[PDB]
C-alpha cells in the first residue's frame, strides 16, 4: 500500500491479460513509454519503479535490507498482492529480469509467463561458464563510478544502447545520471555478486527469452543458456537489431514480440 505511492505504481489500459513492465538499472518505467501504447488497448498493464530508480526518493534505499535481489522481489510481490492481482505475466529487463526468475519460484501461482530482456542468470565469467565480465574489471568498474560517477555514466550509456541512436543514449543518460551515485555502485556491486543458474530448473512459467545481435552485458551464448536450464517452456526470440536497451533504441521491433509473447498465458 506505501509501496504503491513510494515505488510510483501505475495502472493503465485494460484487459483479463495482466502485464508487468520492471526495468533495468539506469532506468525507470519511462523506459518502458514506446513500448506501452502497444499493449494497452489489450493488456492491464502495471509499471513500477524499482527503489534504486532515481525517479524514487532516494532516502528510501535501506541499504542494509537492498544487499540481495529477494528484497526487490519482496518489493515486487508486494505491490502485486496489495492491488489484488492473481495471475500476471511479467517482463523483466536486465536487474529485473532476475527479479522476475526469483519472483515466479517463490509464487508460481502468480507468474504465468515471464518475457526477459537483456537477461543472464550470471554476469561474471566462471568455469566453462561465460558471463562476460571478470572481477578485476568490474573492480575498475567500481572505481571509476565512486571517482566520478557523470564521466563513469558519461561513458557507459552509449555503450549500453549499443547501435548509434542518439535519442537513446541521451535518454539513458539522463536516467543514469538522476541516480544517486551511492545506490547505484550499491545496486551494481549486488547485482555482479547474484548467481541464479542453480534456481533456473525451478521456473516453472513459459519463458521467453530476447536475444538482440549485441550486448555489452550478455554474450550470445547466455540465451541458449537459459533456453537450456530455465524450468519452463522457453524460447528464444530474435531481434534484428542490437542493443541491451531495445525498449529504447528499437521499441517498434521489440513491442512486435511483446504482442506475441503476451497474447496467450
Known sequence: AKLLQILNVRVVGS????????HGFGTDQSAWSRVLPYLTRDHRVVLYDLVCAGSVNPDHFD??????????????????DALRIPRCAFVGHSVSAMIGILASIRRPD?????????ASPRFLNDSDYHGGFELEEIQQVFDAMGANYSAWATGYAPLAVGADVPAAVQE????????????????????????????????????????TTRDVSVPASVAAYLKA?????????????????????????????????LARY
Open 15 to 22: 484487459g483479463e491479460r495482466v502485464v508487468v513492465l520492471s
Open 229 to 261: 536450464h530455465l524450468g519452463g517452456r522457453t524460447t528464444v526470440e530474435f531481434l534484428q537489431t542490437e542493443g541491451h536497451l531495445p525498449h529504447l533504441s528499437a521499441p517498434s521491433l521489440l513491442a512486435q514480440v511483446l504482442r506475441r509473447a
Open 110 to 118: 502468480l507468474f504465468a509467463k515471464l518475457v526477459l530482456i537483456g
Open 63 to 80: 541499504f542494509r535490507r537492498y544487499d540481495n535481489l529477494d528484497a526487490y522481489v519482496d518489493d515486487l510481490l508486494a505491490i502485486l
Open 172 to 211: 539513458f543518460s539522463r536516467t543514469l545520471f538522476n541516480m544517486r551515485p551511492d545506490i547505484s555502485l550499491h545496486v551494481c556491486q549486488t547485482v555482479f555478486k547474484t548467481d541464479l543458474r542453480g534456481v533456473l530448473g525451478m521456473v516453472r512459467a513459459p519463458c521467453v527469452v530476447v536475444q
